[PDB]
Amino acid sequence: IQKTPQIQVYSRHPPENGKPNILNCYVTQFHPPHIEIQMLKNGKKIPKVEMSDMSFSKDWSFYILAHTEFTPTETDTYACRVKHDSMAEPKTVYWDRDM
Amino acid sequence: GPHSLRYFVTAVSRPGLGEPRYMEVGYVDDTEFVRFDSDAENPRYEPRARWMEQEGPEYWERETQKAKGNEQSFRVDLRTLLGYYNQSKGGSHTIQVISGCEVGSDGRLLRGYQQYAYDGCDYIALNEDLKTWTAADMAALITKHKWEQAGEAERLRAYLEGTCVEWLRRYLKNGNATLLRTDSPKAHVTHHSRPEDKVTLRCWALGFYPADITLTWQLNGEELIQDMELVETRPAGDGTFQKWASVVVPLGKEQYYTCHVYHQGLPEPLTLRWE
Amino acid sequence: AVYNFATM
């Protein structure tokens, strides 16, 4: 009974350079519940990340949100790195502002 | 419309690394409002919405004590279940509970629930009658028997019909400006090239509350099913939600396809095309 | 307000 996390990275508002926003990493459909979730800016850990919105779906899989305040620029790269027992390697999903 | 009070409860063993981690997270509708976490620096119930800051110290003390009591009960449960399933003392295991009640727009109970899982599978649940249990396996039958001899269903029923409803009403009252609000979706469509003269059109809905939303793609008044991708509706970090739905269409025929967005906060549904 | 849960 092991399920691999689905990792989604997105901003609250459409990204505009210079304009304050919120970056989200929603990690979903996983089991067991032990998990590490790190948000990255230019390959470096973002401090003071908030964890919220923990729940489970009808099949009992875990859901949880990591989020942080940010102001985008053209050159800054953002990502979310997740470690979970279901994955041989740590998995990184990158923010795609054109998505 | 109708409204819900839900608690998500999790206890997770960690042999060799101290006591289990124990967490309770509470929601009114789609809004996180309270939380208890045993690994916090000073484990106590805490508000997760500004409207809960109005509740006085007696609320917080009473909930915190209930939570420390629950932590100890689930700690015992984890041990008990190793015995029921003949499991080793060296593995990690998880108990989950969803517990709460839904009232209709008239303030009366629509339904109450108490569902348990062990290691991610149905274990035991209270039936819709609020009187009898349904047990998923032979281990849960022991719990069922214990709970019938103890009159557990009657105690749980009293909570679901009385306490749960009454506190839901209070919470809706105290946080009505936040909880009874309606935030309308804002929509846009993005375009992405693919191999072989195909393109992805992705329809975005942003900034909405409550979470319940429906997005559909049309072609000629016809809701598409094939080549559709979507994500589960997801929180955006400020108490609002977002969602997207995409369709793969042939290059040059983008103008035929329309995205339709349906939400409680819209006076009329939104229709939009690639631009 | 959360329920006071029973042992299993």
Q: In whole angstroms, what is the distance from residue B68 CA to residue B58 CA?
A: 15
Tell me whether chains A and C touch (3+ CB pairs under 8 A). no
Q: Identify which of B203, B171, B236 has the alpha carbon closest to the alpha carbon of residue A25.
A: B236
The technique by which this structure was obtained is X-ray
**Ramachandran quadrant class, B84 (left: phi over 0; alpha: psi -120 to 50; beta: rest):** alpha
In contact, B33 and B25? CB cutoff 8 Å? no
* Angle ∠(B33,A8,B241) on CA atoms, nearest 5: 40
Q: What is the DSSP string of B164-187?
A: HHHHHHHHHHHTHHHHS--BPPEE
- The whole-angstrom distance between A67's CA and the closest CA on chain B is 6
**Ramachandran quadrant class, C2 (left: phi over 0; alpha: psi -120 to 50; beta: rest):** beta
Task: Provide the b/e sequence for B117-131 (b: ≥16 CB within 10 Å).
Answer: bbbbebbbbbeeebe
**Helix H or strand E segment including B68:** helix B57-84
Of B24, B66, B152, the CB nearest to C6: B152
Q: Which two tokens stand for residue B169?
A: 């009403």
Q: In whole angstroms, what is the distance from residue A15 CA to residue A4 CA?
A: 29
Q: In whole angstroms, what is the distance from residue B224 CA to residue B201 CA?
A: 13
Q: Identify which of B142, B136, B99 has the alpha carbon closest to the alpha carbon of residue B119.
A: B136
Residues in contact with B139: Cβ distance below 8 Å, sequence separation at least 6, in sequence order: B81, B84, B85, B118, B123
* C-alpha separations of B115 from A9, B9, B132, B156 in Å: 31, 10, 13, 12
Q: Which of B238, B240, B244 to mutate to test the interface with A (most CBs of A within 10 A)?
A: B238
Number of CB pairs, chain B paired with chain C, less than 8 A apart: 50
In contact, B275 and B262? CB cutoff 8 Å? no
Q: In whole angstroms, what is the distance from residue B34 CA to residue B46 CA?
A: 6
Domains of chain A with CATH codes: 1-99 (2.60.40.10)
What is the separation, in whole angstroms, between the first and last Cα of chain B? 36
Give me the residues of A, 58-97, that contact B with CB < 8 A.
59-61, 65, 67
Place of tokens 């032990």: A34
Q: Do C2 and B156 touch (CB under 8 A)?
A: no
Chain C, nearest residue to B124 by Cα: C8
In contact, B245 and B259? CB cutoff 8 Å? yes
Of B48, B120, B238, the CB nearest to A12: B238
Beta bridge partners of B11: B22, B95
Of B74, B95, B99, the CB nearest to C3: B99
User: Hey, is the C-beta of B231 within 8 angstroms of any chain A C-beta?
Assistant: yes
Chain B, nearest residue to A34 by Cα: B12
Q: Do B117 and A60 touch (CB under 8 A)?
A: yes
Which residues of chain C lie closer than 8 angstroms to B116, CB-CB? 8
Q: Identify which of A92, A50, A56, A88 has the alpha carbon closest to the alpha carbon of residue B12.
A: A56
SS3 label, residue B19: coil
Chain C, nearest residue to B142 by Cα: C8
Domains of chain B with CATH codes: 1-181 (3.30.500.10), 182-274 (2.60.40.10)
SS3 label, residue B159: helix
Of B7, B116, B150, the CB nearest to C2: B7
Q: In whole angstroms, what is the distance from residue A56 CA to residue B40 CA?
A: 21
What number of residues does chain A have? 99
Q: In whole angstroms, what is the distance from residue B263 CA to residue A55 CA?
A: 23
Q: In whole angstroms, what is the distance from residue B94 CA to residue A34 CA?
A: 10
Q: In whole angstroms, what is the distance from residue A92 CA to residue A83 CA?
A: 9
Q: Which two tokens stand for residue B10?
A: 């999790």
